[PDB]
Every structure is written in C-alpha cells, then in structure tokens.
Design an enzyme around this catalytic site. Structure first.
Site, mmCIF file in Angstrom:
data_model
loop_
_atom_site.group_PDB
_atom_site.id
_atom_site.type_symbol
_atom_site.label_atom_id
_atom_site.label_comp_id
_atom_site.label_asym_id
_atom_site.label_seq_id
_atom_site.Cartn_x
_atom_site.Cartn_y
_atom_site.Cartn_z
ATOM 1 N N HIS A 198 -19.927 72.002 12.598
ATOM 2 C CA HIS A 198 -19.077 71.290 13.514
ATOM 3 C C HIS A 198 -18.966 69.861 13.033
ATOM 4 O O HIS A 198 -19.672 69.457 12.112
ATOM 5 C CB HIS A 198 -19.603 71.332 14.940
ATOM 6 C CG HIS A 198 -20.938 70.721 15.038
ATOM 7 N ND1 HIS A 198 -22.104 71.388 14.781
ATOM 8 C CD2 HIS A 198 -21.306 69.406 15.293
ATOM 9 C CE1 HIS A 198 -23.134 70.519 14.857
ATOM 10 N NE2 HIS A 198 -22.665 69.293 15.146
ATOM 11 N N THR B 70 -28.533 66.089 18.031
ATOM 12 C CA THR B 70 -27.865 64.910 18.531
ATOM 13 C C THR B 70 -27.101 65.153 19.849
ATOM 14 O O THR B 70 -26.460 64.196 20.340
ATOM 15 C CB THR B 70 -26.920 64.307 17.496
ATOM 16 O OG1 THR B 70 -25.810 65.168 17.346
ATOM 17 C CG2 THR B 70 -27.612 63.989 16.157
HETATM 18 N N1 LIG Z 1 -25.251 67.791 16.354
HETATM 19 S S1 LIG Z 1 -26.487 68.609 15.715
HETATM 20 O O1 LIG Z 1 -26.130 69.095 14.414
HETATM 21 O O2 LIG Z 1 -27.702 67.826 15.819
HETATM 22 C C1 LIG Z 1 -26.764 70.050 16.660
HETATM 23 C C2 LIG Z 1 -26.846 71.313 16.079
HETATM 24 C C3 LIG Z 1 -27.035 72.444 16.850
HETATM 25 C C4 LIG Z 1 -27.163 72.349 18.206
HETATM 26 N N2 LIG Z 1 -27.305 73.542 18.937
HETATM 27 N N3 LIG Z 1 -27.745 73.407 20.108
HETATM 28 N N4 LIG Z 1 -28.058 74.459 20.880
HETATM 29 C C5 LIG Z 1 -29.220 74.070 21.647
HETATM 30 C C6 LIG Z 1 -29.795 74.826 22.821
HETATM 31 C C7 LIG Z 1 -30.607 75.894 22.127
HETATM 32 C C8 LIG Z 1 -29.672 76.944 21.529
HETATM 33 C C9 LIG Z 1 -28.139 76.776 21.552
HETATM 34 C C10 LIG Z 1 -27.577 75.764 20.575
HETATM 35 C C11 LIG Z 1 -27.110 71.115 18.842
HETATM 36 C C12 LIG Z 1 -26.910 69.940 18.077
HETATM 37 ZN ZN LIG Z 2 -23.684 67.576 15.223
#
Ligand SMILES: NS(=O)(=O)c1ccc(/N=N/N2CCCCCC2)cc1
Ligand SMILES: [Zn+2]
Length: 257
Positions: free
Chosen positions: A91, A195
């Site tokens: 993303h 994040t």
């Molecule tokens: N912006 S980031 O890449 O740090 C990122 C990547 C993946 C993420 N997925 N979050 N979820 C968190 C709750 C647990 C499972 C579902 C996905 C959230 C933030």
């Molecule tokens: Zn991200």
C-alpha cells in the site's frame, strides 16, 4: 473510529492504542549523518518472480494490493533479517500536495508518497500470529517523488476508479511488484512498528535510499480516492500519513557508504 481527519488523526490514536507513545514507534526521521554504516548488514534479497497478486482493496485508510501468501513465493530475506519473510500486501501513504505524504523523512525531507511492501516472518505461520512478535514483520519502504512516470505503477493507477470508496475491491491478478523497485537496494534499517492502529511493535523497517519517481498525473489519481464509503459525504483520501515519532533508544543502520 481512527483516521486522518480533523478529529481522529494521529495525535488522538494514543487514547485507543497507548503503545502509540511506546518505545519503538514508526515512522521516524532518518538523520543520514547519524545513521551508521554497518558492514555486517547483507544485501537485501527481494525475490518477487513468483508473486501472485489477487486483489486490490480500498480499506478506508489506503488501498492494499493483496497477494497469495499460502505458498512460498515472494519473499524478502537477507539485509538485516534472520529468516524468510513472505509478501502479503503493499500500500501507499500520500499527501494532498507534492510536498508531503511520506511517513519516514530523510533529514526532515518529506517525499510525495511512500510505498510499503509488507512481509511476515514464516516462522510464525501466518500474518496474524506474526504481528504479535517483535520480529514478526519486515516492511520495505520506498519513497516516491514526482517527476517521470513509473510505468509499472500505471496498472494500479488505472484500477483506482473501480475502488473509489471504502470496502470496494477489484480483482487484480498478475501484477508484478518488481516494477515498483528503484534501481539500488541500498537501505536504512531500524526496529519499529505498524504506522496505523493497532501500532504494534512488530516491524523490522527497511527503507530504501533511492526513491522512485512517479508522474503528477499518477499521484493525482491516488488523491481522487475517498476515505468514505459509497453514499457518504465525500472525503478525499489524502494525507494518510503518520508524522515522525521519537527515535528513543534506537539506532538506524545504513547498508552503504
Ligand atoms: N503502514 S504499515 O506498513 O506499518 C502497516 C502494515 C500492515 C498493517 N496491517 N495491520 N493489520 C493489523 C491488525 C492485525 C491484522 C490485520 C492487519 C498495518 C500497518
Ligand atoms: Zn504503511
């Protein structure tokens, strides 16, 4: 619920998620002069030749391009990592203007956007179990600047009108994420967090030094997305980035120079 609006943005997240004020939050400013070159760091190994994209989803905070992560396919290894991390989704975060949008900053420089390729450590069996571990995820972050178009981005851009609003998805097969990678894999790395809420402290961050350039027209199409669902008041999906957080007791290491 949390968001990037006038009332529920990053400075409020700590009320629902108190590790927002934790010891290893992301993003951070990468002060390039103080990052130390670590000759023990290995070249990054990015092996995306069998990556299998399936779908693209507007989740209300960004859009995710999702992959088949049920086989050993697109993985990330080497670099600072022990073991094998499998690609699950990518993303972006981006701004309302070209002068902001990235989550990480470099000597306080904001980029127009930032790509996050999200991978989970196979030793934990699935993504949901990995995010509960201190070494569960590896996120490869790539800056975007506005200039010449990125031809390997255009397939993503053109599908966006089909997922304008939250909850919409579209099939998105055969997308090759190698077309989003700058020429150099030189990087900075540090231990941090997701994040977005829940802000879990489970990420080894790998931030590439070389940005990719995308055109104004490409980034303009990101900014036509909406945070809202269909039939709700239109809120353009812009400025979906968290500001830099305190580095606290952390060292950023450089793979180069
Ligand atoms: N912006 S980031 O890449 O740090 C990122 C990547 C993946 C993420 N997925 N979050 N979820 C968190 C709750 C647990 C499972 C579902 C996905 C959230 C933030
Ligand atoms: Zn991200």
């Amino acid at each position: 619920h949390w968001g990037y609006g006038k009332h529920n943005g990053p400075e409020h997240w700590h009320k629902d998620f108190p590790i927002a004020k934790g010891e290893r939050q992301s993003p951070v400013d990468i002060d390039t002069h103080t990052a130390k070159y670590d000759p023990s760091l290995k070249p990054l190994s990015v092996s995306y030749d069998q990556a299998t994209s399936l779908r693209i989803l507007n989740n209300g905070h960004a859009f995710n391009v999702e992959f088949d992560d049920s086989q050993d396919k697109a993985v990330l290894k080497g670099g600072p990592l022990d073991g094998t991390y499998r690609l699950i989704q990518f993303h972006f975060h981006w701004g309302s203007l070209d002068g902001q949008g990235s989550e990480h900053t470099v000597d306080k420089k904001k980029y127009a956007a930032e790509l996050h390729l999200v991978h989970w450590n196979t030793k934990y069996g699935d993504f949901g179990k990995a995010v509960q571990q201190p070494d569960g995820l590896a996120v490869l972050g790539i800056f975007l600047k506005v200039g010449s178009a990125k031809p390997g981005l255009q397939k993503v851009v053109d599908v966006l009108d089909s997922i304008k609003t939250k909850g919409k998805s579209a099939d998105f097969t055969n997308f090759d994420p190698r077309g989003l990678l700058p020429e150099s894999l030189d990087y900075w790395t540090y231990p941090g967090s997701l994040t977005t809420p829940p802000l879990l402290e489970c990420v080894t961050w790998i931030v590439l030094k070389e940005p990719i350039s995308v055109s104004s027209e490409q980034v303009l199409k990101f900014r036509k997305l909406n945070f809202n669902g269909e039939g709700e008041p239109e809120e353009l999906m812009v400025d979906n980035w968290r500001p830099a957080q305190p580095l606290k007791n952390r060292q950023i290491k450089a793979s180069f120079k």
